């Protein structure tokens, strides 16, 4: 069925080029609110314990996620076995001496793969014993995503959560843009008579997008929709390069 | 496309579902002139069952499985030229 996956991905490239000519986007409009997405979280290869507990924190962060083990899983048959499992997103974590550095999000049914550098992390497994996470299907909040690339990353980044939470649904997850650095925290709260009081729990980090390829994770022949430009002579002069 | 089916679905598209031109776009033959010879000799199945009439419209959900049968001369010489003729399953 390699001719089937090639024909469907060639149809996908045509649909993306046609939508970019006549500019929820094209890749997600079939399943914007119907199917609750499932997320497979993996590490790089022979992970460290600190990276593994960070991946456990990420699996606990956004629901319908399993933390699949990664040792001697070859990447192409990994992603096609994930396709035959028929889940939706893959999330790969690359570390450096226990500090995680790369978070690759791949919406693998012929969809986009974004890649994020992941700068200042804080792990609740090595700070705070306060109990379990809340694990309710959360609310999401986003701060000044106004660029077209910002709308694209907020689409592929909020289309991995549980669709349609309730009013009582407690935990909120923030994605704040502070000059092309998506800062992530997540909180629970109550409503006081004075107002609202938040409680920081779970991870915190900030991620900078650096590649956003139209193909799947394994190919490396994927046409680049966007990647940053580190070495132009106007790099530090604008945002969403 | 909803209302602009007035102009595009013509002879050049309704004949593009034909098994000879789908064969030629799948590069299973040199041209139509011998693709019709193959599928009239009865070497080419689609799905599980063999198809012989060279006016068949392969549908959308059957274009993936229009392949040569087992135990045929052209499948044998294809696997011979590639030198991968796994002769357990008949060819």
């Amino acid at each position: 069925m390699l001719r089937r996956q090639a024909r469907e991905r060639r149809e996908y490239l045509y649909r993306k080029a046609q939508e970019l000519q006549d500019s929820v986007d094209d890749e997600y409009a079939a399943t914007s609110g119907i199917m609750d997405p499932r997320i497979i979280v993996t590490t790089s290869r022979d992970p460290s314990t600190r990276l593994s507990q960070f991946a456990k924190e990420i699996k606990l962060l956004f629901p319908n996620a399993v933390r699949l083990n990664r040792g001697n899983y070859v990447m192409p048959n990994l992603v096609d076995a994930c396709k035959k499992s028929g889940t939706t997103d893959l999330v790969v974590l690359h570390e450096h001496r226990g500090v995680p550095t790369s978070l690759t999000i791949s919406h693998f049914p012929h969809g986009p793969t974004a890649q994020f550098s992941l700068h200042n992390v804080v792990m609740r497994h090595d700070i705070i014993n306060a109990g379990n996470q809340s694990e309710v299907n959360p609310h999401l909040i986003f701060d000044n995503f106004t660029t077209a690339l910002g709308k694209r990353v907020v689409c592929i980044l909020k289309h991995l959560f549980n669709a349609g939470p309730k009013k009582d649904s407690e935990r909120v997850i923030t994605f704040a843009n502070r000059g092309d650095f998506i800062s992530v925290r997540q909180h629970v709260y109550v409503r006081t008579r004075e107002g609202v009081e938040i409680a920081e729990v779970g991870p915190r980090f900030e991620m900078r997008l650096f590649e956003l390829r139209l193909g799947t994770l394994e190919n490396k022949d994927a046409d680049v929709e966007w990647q940053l430009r580190r070495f132009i002579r106007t790099a530090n002069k604008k945002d969403y390069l | 496309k909803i209302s602009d089916l007035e102009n595009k679905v013509t002879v050049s598209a309704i004949c593009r579902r034909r098994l000879p031109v789908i064969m030629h776009r799948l590069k299973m033959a040199e041209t139509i002139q011998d693709a019709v010879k193959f599928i009239e000799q009865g070497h080419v199945r689609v799905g599980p069952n063999l198809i012989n009439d060279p006016a068949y419209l392969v549908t959308r959900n059957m274009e993936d499985y229009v392949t040569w049968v087992d135990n045929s001369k052209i499948k044998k010489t294809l696997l011979r030229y590639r030198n991968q003729i796994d002769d357990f399953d008949f060819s």
């Binding site: 390699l2 001719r3 090639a6 190919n219 022949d221 | 799948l26 590069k27 299973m28 033959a29 040199e30 011998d34 392949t67 040569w68 052209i74 499948k75 010489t77 294809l78 030229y81």
Partner: peptide, 19 residues
């Protein structure tokens, strides 16, 4: 050529492939 290799379509046949 890597893209054509990843879409090789393993059932191609011509008259020139006999030797």
């Amino acid at each position: 050529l890597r893209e054509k290799a990843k879409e090789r379509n393993p059932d191609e046949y011509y008259h020139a492939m006999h030797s």
